[PDB]
């Protein structure tokens, strides 16, 4: 791609998400989602192979269906309220359709079935955009309509996302599908605390974006898309095994790491509202996520898989890749738990 065209298209992706974040009219919400989808389609077809076209086709169909359900929710809101303010909705049918549309955009279960496919079909940078930046606009719309969201629906979507993202990653060896099922489980954790305390939703989103950006940046810096090529990292760059170790132990939520920070705070807000069974079962289900994280750490950091002979050639060349913000994101995704009361800046 022309680098100017890449810059303009990424600015248009950012422009669509910012238009979702700043607008007060539902048509401009729908326009921001349309602009976001339209501009992110060339990011997914960056390498021009049939898997990228299949992934972009599946992504287009799911996001287009969600955009139509979003506009139907908007139009039913205009029926039953005669206005367009991006606020609570004035009909439970429009609220259900908008919650379904945003669950389709986030890829929350049972609308999750596109997320491990599309992330597999696209490069690591476009998968990073899809799993970090593409969550921000629907979580903003869910942030602003929470006086109308059905509790039973949002918690059903949450627990179904956490369980299916837990069981889905246990069978994987491809790293992008592992990050995609990790995405489904973490979006379940974000929407489970939305009606209780949306500041903890924003906290979980920020810590998730930091940890996912760290893991995709490590996968780009080591050029590894599979488990078994990630296991060659100790013979190529031994520091990267330490970094994937501490970041995967963070993403499982082990204290004293910072990925323990969101889910604990989520439990801290779900027991105030007299829900004990639900965050307990959520926390027990997150052990599955931690299990396949531990599988990746056993393959990469804590053991040494056998390498090949041609690795000895790559010993003579340092990494020329711009590992952008990788030490910053590595420090932030691990050593941030002593600064847990910083979360009040998200209120």
């Amino acid at each position: 791609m022309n680098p100017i065209i890449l810059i303009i298209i990424l600015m248009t992706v950012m422009l669509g998400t910012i238009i979702v974040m700043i607008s007060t009219h539902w048509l401009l919400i729908w326009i921001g989602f349309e602009m976001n989808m339209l501009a992110i389609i060339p990011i997914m077809m960056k390498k021009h192979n049939p898997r990228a076209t299949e992934a972009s086709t599946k992504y287009f169909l799911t996001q287009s269906t969600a955009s139509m359900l979003l506009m139907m929710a908007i139009i039913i809101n205009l029926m039953f309220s005669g206005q367009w303010t991006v606020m609570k909705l004035f009909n439970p049918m429009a609220s259900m359709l908008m919650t379904m549309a945003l669950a389709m955009k986030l890829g929350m279960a049972p609308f999750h079935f596109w997320v491990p496919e599309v992330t597999q079909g696209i490069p690591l940078s476009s998968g990073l955009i899809l799993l970090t930046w593409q969550k921000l606009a629907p979580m903003s719309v869910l942030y602003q309509i929470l006086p109308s969201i059905n509790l039973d629906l949002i918690l059903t979507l949450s627990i179904l996302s956490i369980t299916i993202g837990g069981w889905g990653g246990l069978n994987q060896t491809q790293l992008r599908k592992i990050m995609a099922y990790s995405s489904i489980a973490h979006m379940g954790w974000m929407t489970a605390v939305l009606l209780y305390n949306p500041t903890m939703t924003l906290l979980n989103l920020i810590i998730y974006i930091i940890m996912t950006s760290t893991m995709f940046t490590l996968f780009m810096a080591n050029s590894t898309t599979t488990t078994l090529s990630l296991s060659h990292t100790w013979n190529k760059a031994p520091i990267m095994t330490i970094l994937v170790l501490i970041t995967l132990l963070s993403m499982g939520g082990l204290p004293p790491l910072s990925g323990f920070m969101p889910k604990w705070m989520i439990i801290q807000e779900m027991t105030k509202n007299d829900s004990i069974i639900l965050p307990t079962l959520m926390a027990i289900t997150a052990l599955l996520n931690l299990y396949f994280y531990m599988r990746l750490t056993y393959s990469t950091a804590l053991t040494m898989f056998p390498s090949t002979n041609n690795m000895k050639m790559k010993w003579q060349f340092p990494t020329t890749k711009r590992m952008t913000l990788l030490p910053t994101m590595t420090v932030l995704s691990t050593m941030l738990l002593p600064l847990t009361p910083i979360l009040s800046i998200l209120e």
Partner: protein, 98 residues
Amino acid sequence: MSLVYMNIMMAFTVSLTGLLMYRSHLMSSLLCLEGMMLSLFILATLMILNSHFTLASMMPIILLVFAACEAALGLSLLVMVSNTYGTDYVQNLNLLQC
């Protein structure tokens, strides 16, 4: 409420269930998607013309234009699928199971 809204919502649900149950062609899916858009256009239009809400009369045109651009993008994706397999059959798009 009014009787024409029943038919326009039922049209949106019929085009929904057509778009949610693929047969073989991706073009038929795109036609169901644009039927969903057309019913949204009609429903928005009948409300805004009924309510005499003047500033939203430019709203359905916008709802047309973006979504037709969306349709263009969908057609382009279909063509790329058709330039890989020769057909736009949705069962050819199954490589991402593994």
